[PDB]
């Protein structure tokens, strides 16, 4: 390994969201975070469905609005298209301009406990939504309507489209779904009981997870590695060793064979998948336990949310840009 030069790695911004004066503060830390693919925005969700957006590395507040009834619970996931942001809750899917101007609202009867969504074979015109339930729904993003309802035997915690729709079940397996037909092409046993994170490029899947979900006998423990799958040749690869215990992972958008791996103490490894021997190590200083992680489209911004309600942006002191 090799330590990171402070001239390349520093804390660029921080925000408390939800802060103590926020109506959702009582309900807990952020539920999810994601870099927008435009306008230099980072989006943060609350446990009751507030969405907050923040500009640039200093996380200047931009817009904020609730995207479903607060009884619906956590904001589960963001997706981004040219017209606006798509927001997923357990009971509904919402789309609004980045201004906060409503675009459409879908609250379908088969939306009982949605957890995940992804694009499909149609660019940004269509999404697949699923969760801990035995139905999936296909949504026309332009019309803002459900166009198809599908049965599923496996329940999903994550979905992401790259070469295929990579679908993490709540049992720790990954289904690789045909993006046109949604049929399972291949099942991959990633972790024993759960997947805490999934990312994918056109050539790889990477996951973090563990062997058992939480009981009163045993806390859920994360694995000392990232699991890796070759999407090009459809076979498993050697795992990436990660002794600090791998909680989150993102593929580097510019270094195409490289993964960014994060543990709950905010320790980060930037590691080439093809040879793990050379990885850059750096540390962040989260107040609490790291709960969420994302990387910007340029690769220059790294965001981490902790269980003390902080979200941090780290990166180079040298004029970073989130997209373009």
């Amino acid at each position: 390994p090799h330590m990171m030069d402070s001239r390349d790695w520093t804390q660029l911004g921080c925000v408390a969201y939800p802060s103590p004066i926020h109506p959702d503060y009582h309900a807990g830390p952020a539920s999810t975070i994601a870099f927008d693919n435009q306008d230099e925005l980072l989006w943060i969700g609350t446990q009751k469905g507030f969405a907050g957006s923040f500009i640039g590395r200093e996380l200047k507040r931009f817009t904020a609005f609730r995207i479903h009834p607060e009884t619906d619970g956590p904001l589960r996931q963001f997706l981004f298209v040219d017209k606006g942001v798509i927001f997923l809750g357990s009971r509904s899917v919402y789309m609004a301009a980045r201004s906060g101007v409503p675009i459409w609202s879908i609250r379908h009867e088969s939306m009982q406990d949605l957890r995940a969504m992804s694009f499909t074979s149609k660019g940004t015109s269509e999404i697949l939504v699923a969760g801990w339930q035995n139905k999936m729904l296909v949504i026309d993003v332009n019309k803002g309507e459900v166009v198809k309802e599908l049965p599923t035997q496996d329940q999903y915690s994550f979905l992401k489209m790259s070469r295929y729709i990579c679908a993490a079940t709540n049992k720790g397996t990954v289904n690789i779904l045909d993006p046109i037909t949604f049929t399972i092409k291949k099942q991959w046993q990633a972790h024993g009981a759960f997947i805490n994170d999934l990312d994918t490029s056109n050539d790889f899947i990477v996951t973090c997870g563990g062997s058992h979900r939480q009981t009163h006998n045993t806390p859920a423990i994360l694995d000392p590695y990232v699991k890796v799958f070759d999407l090009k040749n459809m076979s498993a690869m050697n795992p990436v060793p990660f002794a600090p215990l791998a909680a989150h992972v993102r593929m580097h958008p510019r270094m195409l064979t490289t993964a960014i791996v994060v543990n709950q103490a905010g320790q980060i490894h930037v590691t080439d998948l093809l040879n793990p021997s050379n990885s850059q190590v750096c540390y962040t200083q989260p107040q609490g336990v790291v709960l969420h992680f994302d990387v910007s489209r340029t690769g220059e911004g790294k965001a981490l949310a902790d269980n003390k309600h902080n979200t941090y942006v780290w990166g180079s002191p040298n004029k970073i840009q989130f997209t373009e």
Binding site: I21, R61, F62, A64, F65, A96, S99, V101, P102
Partner: protein
Amino acid sequence: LENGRIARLMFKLSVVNERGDHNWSETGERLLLKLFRDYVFHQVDADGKARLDTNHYLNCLSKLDASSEEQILLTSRDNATVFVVSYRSIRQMLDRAYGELGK
């Protein structure tokens, strides 16, 4: 004339705001139009003294009439909800809300 135009927008704004009472988009649109009303008519200084300014009312309403692309910052009392939105967008939302009441 322009006075007539302003008056008509006032009717619509008054009619759609604080009524009695489906989908989630409606909730956001109602809130946005209420915060717009507050931006125009309920400005306060530091220490919360009412800031009366007829020119401010005329300017906001004129920009609404013209669907200006100028963006304004609308915030809820508790600072939780924040919209950054154009007069053009607000105008469209107002006219639609008023239209829907007539149905």
